[PDB]
Amino acid sequence: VMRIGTMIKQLLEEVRAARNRLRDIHATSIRELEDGLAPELREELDRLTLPFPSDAELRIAQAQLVGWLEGLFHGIQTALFAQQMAARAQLQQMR
Amino acid sequence: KVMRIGTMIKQLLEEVRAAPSRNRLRDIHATSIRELEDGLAPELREELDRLTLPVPSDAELRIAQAQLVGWLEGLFHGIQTALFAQQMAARAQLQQMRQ
Amino acid sequence: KVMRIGTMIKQLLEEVRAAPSRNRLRDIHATSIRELEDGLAPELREELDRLTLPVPSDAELRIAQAQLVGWLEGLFHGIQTALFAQQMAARAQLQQMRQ
Amino acid sequence: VMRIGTMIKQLLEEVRAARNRLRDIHATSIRELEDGLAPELREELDRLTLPFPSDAELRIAQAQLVGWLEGLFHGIQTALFAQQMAARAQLQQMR
Description:
The structure is a homotetramer.
Chain A: H1 4-13, H2 20-34, H3 41-44, H4 55-92
PDB class: gene regulation
Keywords: Activator, gene regulation
Assembly: tetrameric
């Protein structure tokens, strides 16, 4: 289930305007990505945030969050493809 | 495979963490995208349509580096959660067939 | 879906278990195959190429009924183990990415 | 992993010749299908065998084992297809 996929798209755009907002978005993304996670959450919430404030670190912190969101989308995406492609191969072994 | 993709990433991520240029950060990025486009048609058009992080200045580098960390980290956890979801969906479907 | 397939089977299996004809056992079979060929090209040629269990005698019926039980049971557990394998492969792949 | 798939094919043919052999094959099939199974094995080994001896019950018991093996193959097969098809749909949601 890729609800997360659609949310990444929308969350991606908000990534630009004129820091609480930035920190807020990252948090949203992580909560939606967690859904249900086992204690593995530690790694996902192990100082998994942007680095802090001066404008420099806000230009920086905001770039970090564009790549993070693109990464999730394409990681999810290629993994999803692997899945479809593996099931096909496994089947091509029918013969 | 998907394991091959993850382990390289873990590596590219450590390769950037300790950095100084304009060719290093651009290569790490190319490298990562070279790994994903393991036979997936023209959707490669999404990654191969640039999507590259924006004598260069010093501050400009830091900003670009930060974006790379997210890209590399995003790909890692994006895969990870696609995997866990795949595993949970099979779990559920098994319990539906209680018998 | 795959859950839809399993639950119908559980039902067809109980529909045969308590039987007396030559049209009942043939319908239960048709029914099961009608369920599998949920949009899968010409591989339907495998199931739709007869593959039907062999005024008929009495003993002949018992033999045919037994074969149906295996077919219905086979489809159930065949799915079940494809599901568990799918779930285990995702599990493993997750543990490879220890970090 | 569909090793089981290839074994079903081979095990399927042995299904005809001229009861220990019959009972032996079913057992083989179940062991190869178990690989690793959780306590769920009970259901798979809950009087999951052919019914016993007179020829009548050997014609019968052997028919049961042809369908069982065909069933496993096509159950595994369609489930495998579902898998590939679901991963594709989930992806078609990218847009």
